Amino acid sequence: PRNISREESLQLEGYKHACHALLHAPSQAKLFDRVPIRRVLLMMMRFDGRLGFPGGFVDTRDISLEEGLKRELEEELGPALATVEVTEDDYRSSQVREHPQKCVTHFYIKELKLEEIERIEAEAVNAKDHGLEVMGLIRVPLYTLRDRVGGLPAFLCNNFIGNSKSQLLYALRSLKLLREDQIQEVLKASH
């Protein structure tokens, strides 16, 4: 894909748009009582056997990017999202491609309280798309284990849809979770 501004992407004609969101909350939990979780980051296994972020297509002639995302988040993540307001303030980036098809992808990042993310996971099973478009929700491991591979580097060898891996890596840098050198180390160990 190619980087584009929101305003520029919204002036385009004959492009399909999609919105996807990273929902996250801080955690005081420690794996094996020693390895800090740091933060809960939500992704999903999709119907197509690839990992991704919740969200989907939006017809911007009908509804705003935010309204489209909202509807798609309720379908995929479930009832608990009616208490969540992902707004324009949560918008981060847009990327554009022309092949195979003209598509713009918008990426949102929204911090929640831990209890809020926990409620989302608990009610995700009740989503309209559970066991269909959505095959399950997963947390992203942020740590690297002692073997220097387990955790995030191994996670990054899974199968990701579209530019979702790049969006994840963007969030990690954006949220100041990992330094640039740390991101490169994680990608080296992964490959």
Place this chain on the structure above:
Amino acid sequence: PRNISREESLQLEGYKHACHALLHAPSQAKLFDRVPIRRVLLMMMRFDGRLGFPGGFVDTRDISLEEGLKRELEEELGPALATVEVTEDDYRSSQVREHPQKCVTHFYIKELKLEEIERIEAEAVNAKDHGLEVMGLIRVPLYTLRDRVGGLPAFLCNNFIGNSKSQLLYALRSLKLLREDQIQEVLKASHR
């Protein structure tokens, strides 16, 4: 990994033992009202960023391979499992390996009702290991989409722990969900 009898494996001192289980249930659901789900098969995202089946290390001097499995299932999947039977009749295969620790793995396949699986997924959030060892449950796509890659072939390109991928393909044949040529077709399509 190498195939080994259950009877032979327990008499092999110095080896560590682990037990893992495929819990599954039939389904009448259709993806996009078109592609039959056929069956719900449970796997998980692990703390280590790999996909696997629920279960884990079982001390053989402690109790039976069944008992060690049942406690891990409750630990990983939650309190719903206390009610789930589990028996030697659910045992399927054992694999032994030397490289990277001496390890015997036992594979279990148990068919449940769809409601039971649904209840399991719904209370998984309550499991001692949710958000720790277990990063979330997932269902396995059994179908292949029109592009001939999406669904099962794409799913098999994920990162699988140990021989869990081998184990899954065994189950797909074992439960007669795919023939051998069909399995060979998804593996090539996957690796392409």
